[PDB]
Design a protein around this ligand. Structure first.
Ligand SMILES: *[C@@H](CC(=O)OCC)[C@H](C[C@@H]1CCNC1=O)NC(=O)[C@H](Cc1ccccc1)NC(=O)[C@H](CCC(=O)OC(C)(C)C)NC(=O)OCc1ccccc1
Ligand SMILES: *[C@@H](CC(=O)OCC)[C@H](C[C@@H]1CCNC1=O)NC(=O)[C@H](Cc1ccccc1)NC(=O)[C@H](CCC(=O)OC(C)(C)C)NC(=O)OCc1ccccc1
Lengths: 188, 188
């Protein structure tokens, strides 16, 4: 069966509602004050988190070595609460998955769970005109309002929802090495 | 925890998408070719079931002995498939419930699950200007599109969603005695 209990534990402790100039997105907090949001949310230097204006201390829009959009933006937030560290539930490698759940936490849908079935490592996607890599696909008719929704199986947080064509939905992958405590590098 | 597995088994075997002049509603099939839909769906002599036009052989809009709306309409459909008989999961009596799930099956949301928390026997509701009785209430911001959504706990199908005021949601109760094989009576 789908891992609804795991999905709910992730939603309860690790999601907030984020709101940018582009609208509301489910937001997964990963560790400390670090979270993710789809790049097309257009994060600026402030963002609303559960309707509280919040400084964005850092925002890194991920791209691969072909200089192609991965659609994941990692943000560091000026907030008091730390997120539960869920890096150990992130997969190490690209993979296909069985019986996944997509979970949403927005003003409109404060906690909703959608079994999306099998998830395949899809690869290239033309996402609203932007070439994008490392995409996961599920055969489910996902909708506007679900961007940032968290995709899980039991024990794994595998991606966040970023797109759909009316019949299929698409998530950007989350990989463990995106969040490892790292180096010294001018990035802006 | 919420009974997601029970909710999913009910959705899988016992729901269809119904569409009337008023729009789409999740539809719970109860037994044989008998199903329910909110009275305010305005069922006529035909209805679309999973987009197939279907004769409504009977429609009974339930009212209590005070001649007040209960908001449940029981329909008998001209279809080949029988519904799995789930009358044994219907409660005998009015009651309050813990940790319920609201499940939706529409074109827009083909299977989505919302934990709504505690459900209380609420009683009277002015529902869009119509006095209505036997209402269940949950503190969840339910939305248009969710009418007919099935409310369960484990082992019990307790109501269908009919209304909301922006902060709370409301279901019409389902009781076991609504569906017992019965009498001889001119009802139209
Ligand atoms: C979430 C963000 C959102 O709702 O918009 C705020 C501006 C969207 C989820 C999608 C939309 C439809 N169903 C879904 O699952 N994602 C998008 O809209 C993305 C762009 C985006 C991503 C993240 C943040 C902000 C914006 N674009 C698409 O998914 C695009 C379809 C857009 C669309 O039709 O939306 C409506 C609601 C206006 C109808 N789909 C897409 O590119 O699919 C791939 C494709 C390849 C080739 C040909 C056609 C499509
Ligand atoms: C499901 C049916 C639907 O979407 O409309 C098709 C015509 C609705 C679910 C509600 C709507 C808002 N959130 C929900 O959970 N139900 C209704 O709209 C019902 C009427 C109804 C029922 C069944 C079938 C068809 C129609 N009406 C209400 O719930 C009403 C609010 C209507 C409303 O504001 O909807 C929008 C989307 C246009 C904003 N709520 C209500 O009566 O609450 C009790 C109340 C008591 C005292 C004062 C104010 C409210």
């Amino acid at each position: 069966g789908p891992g609804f209990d795991f999905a709910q534990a992730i939603m309860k402790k690790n999601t907030v509602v984020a709101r940018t100039e582009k609208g509301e997105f489910t937001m997964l907090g990963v560790h400390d004050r670090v979270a993710v949001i789809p790049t097309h949310a257009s994060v600026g230097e402030t963002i609303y988190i559960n309707d509280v204006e919040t400084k964005v201390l850092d925002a890194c829009a991920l791209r691969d070595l072909t200089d192609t959009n991965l659609e994941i933006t990692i943000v560091k937030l000026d907030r008091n609460q730390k997120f539960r560290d869920i890096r150990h539930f992130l997969p190490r490698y690209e993979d296909d998955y069985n019986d996944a759940v997509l979970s949403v936490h927005t003003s409109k849908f404060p906690n909703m769970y959608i079994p999306v079935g099998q998830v395949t490592n899809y690869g290239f996607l033309n996402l609203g005109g932007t070439p994008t890599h490392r995409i996961l696909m599920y055969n489910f008719p996902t909708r506007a309002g679900q961007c940032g929704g968290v995709v899980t199986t039991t024990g794994k947080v595998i991606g966040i929802h970023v797109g759909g064509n009316g019949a299929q939905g698409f998530a950007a992958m989350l990989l463990h090495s995106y969040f490892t405590d790292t180096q010294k590098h001018h990035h802006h």
